[PDB]
Structure formats: C-alpha cells, structure tokens
Structure 1
C-alpha cells in the first residue's frame, strides 16, 4: 500500500533539518604554509551555543597571512578552552589543549577530537560532546597512524591529518533524565522533525510491514536482510545477534 514513514524522510520536504539559528559549520582551519610548516596563532574571541548541537563552539580569530585581514573560524570547543586564550595550530604547535596539530606529531596515548578523517577535510571524527579519539600508534614509513575512535573501532589514518588536542566540551549531557515529553519536544525542534515516534505495530498494515492484526504483534521476525527493499527494511537490520 503506502510509502512508509522512513521512505518519506529521504524526500526531505518536512524531514529536512532545521538550520535557521545554527551558527555555522564547526570546521577546522584550512591547511596552508603556516599550518603545514610552522604554527599560526589565533585567539578565542568567544564561546558559543549552536542549536541542535551538544558541543559548544569557539569563535577563533587569526590573521590571514597574505591580506591584512582578520579571518575567523568555528572550532568545536575543547573542554577547558576559554576566552582571551590563544590557540596555536600547525605542525610546530605545542602539545597543549585546544591546539590543533597533526596526529603524526603528537605522541601515543594523546587524546584528541575534531580529528580529520582524511587530510585537509577540516575535522570529521569525534566532535560530538563528551567524545574523543586516542592516537594509538605510528608507522613512520607509510606516514600513517592508527587511531581508536569513540565507537571502539581502530581506524588507520594519514599521519598528516590534524586534530585538536583534548576532548570535546559539554560532556555527560546524557546523564540527566529528560522527564517531560515537553523536554523531548524542545530538544528535537531545534534539530529536525523526528520526534514523537509511532511504533509500526500501531499502524495499519498499509503503512508499515508490522501493521494490522487483532493484537498489536509483529507477526514476522523483526530481524531482516540488508539485501532488503526499502519498505521492508524495518526493525533490526542485518542484526548479527539480537537479544540482551
């Protein structure tokens, strides 16, 4: 029968992201001679809130080294950053917090975040809120580094690609109970139309594959192939094991 809620989120329309009040992307500084070879110094002009994001950001202003012009960025705030602090970054950057330097430089056991997945990408892994990666180990030839991500996975990475030292700010957000449905409503409203979520068991059998029945039951196994046409792929996708 129907195209199911889920198939519909792909068309955008109503399920697009809410992004009026969002303060910008939360990138790293782009690479250049100064970053590449020395270290450019900038100052943290302010620390900011960014709707739909648990991490706070940091307006960090540098000086463009070509035009007389004060360029500025939005770093995700490393925890313990503050205003009127300087934020050095580059190869020859000093290994202290809120200081973006290549993973290859920094020693083993070094905690980082906003870490570039591929060199020059401007900060992709570990940029959530209480999250960080740890630099495991370096292979000097091949110019590669092994990094342990917050998911647990131990991804291999180019030693050139940068990261900000320290963890992300605003950690332990998810320790607080929400309590009020209202409090949930207010969270997702500054994000996207994804909240009060209706269980496919509730639905009639035209709008979901679990729907219908004289008793709210699933009726088929809730685990499912991932060679599964969009419209059935519902429940537990490719679920290797399923229980507790």
Structure 2
C-alpha cells in the first residue's frame, strides 16, 4: 500500500534537479533575418563548466543586429572551439567546426 520509489520520484521536492550552480540553459541563438537569409559573426568569450552536464558550455557574445546592445548565448561547446574564435551562424556561414548553419 506504500507508493513505489518511481511514483514518489515523479512528484518533486526531493527528486527534482539541483539547478543552483547550473551555469544556464544550453540553447542555440534565436532565428531572425541574419540567420535565415545570410550569416552573423559572434566571438567565443570563454568555454565554461556547467555543474550537472558532462560537456562544457561556451559564452558566444554576438552583436545585436537591431539594438545597440551586445547579446550573449550559452552554446554547447563543439570539440575544438577556443576563446576569441569567430563562430559564424546563419544560411551563408561556412562548413567548419563550431560554425552553425541549417
């Protein structure tokens, strides 16, 4: 009549993930006009360790194509990426490591 461990795991409180020191959501950059029709250049700032992820992450600081601000995206660091490497993203971007394209 006691609930099994898996059923208790589904609830939360105790079996939830420890997301305190997690260095952020590893996601790509959002699609816009500078992704779909051409490319955009953004520099790799620093390869970083995410607690609770085997692979490292990369703070790749792109220039904002619309605003005066400068945007920063947490990519999954490709093997052979380094700091100050130019990573180009979009349709017309080249086919080499880190260089994301559709």
TM interval, shorter chain, is: over 0.9
Matched, 1:8 2:8: yes
C-alpha separation in 2, matches of 1:37 and 1:72: 21
Higher relative contact order (CA 8 A, sep 6+): 2
Deviation of 1:46 after TM superposition, in Å, equals 0.4
C-alpha separation in 2, matches of 1:65 and 1:77: 23
C-alpha separation in 1, matches of 2:60 and 2:52: 21
The ranges of structure 1 where at least 4 consecutive aligned residues each deviate by more than 2 angstroms after the TM superposition are none
Deviation of 1:34 after TM superposition, in Å, equals 0.3
Deviation of 1:13 after TM superposition, in Å, equals 1.2
Deviation of 1:7 after TM superposition, in Å, equals 0.5
TM-score (norm 1): 0.41
C-alpha separation in 1, matches of 2:93 and 2:55: 24
Deviation of 1:79 after TM superposition, in Å, equals 0.1
SS of residue in 1 equivalent to 2:10:
helix
Alignment partner, residue 61 of structure 1 = 61
Deviation of 1:68 after TM superposition, in Å, equals 0.5
Larger Cα-atom Rg: 1
Alignment partner, residue 41 of structure 2 = 41
Q: Give the total of aligned pairs.
A: 101
CA-to-aligned-CA distance 1:61-80 (integer Å, 9 cap, x gap)? 00111110100000000000
C-alpha separation in 2, matches of 1:78 and 1:97: 7
Deviation of 1:42 after TM superposition, in Å, equals 0.3
Deviation of 1:52 after TM superposition, in Å, equals 0.7
Deviation of 1:25 after TM superposition, in Å, equals 0.4
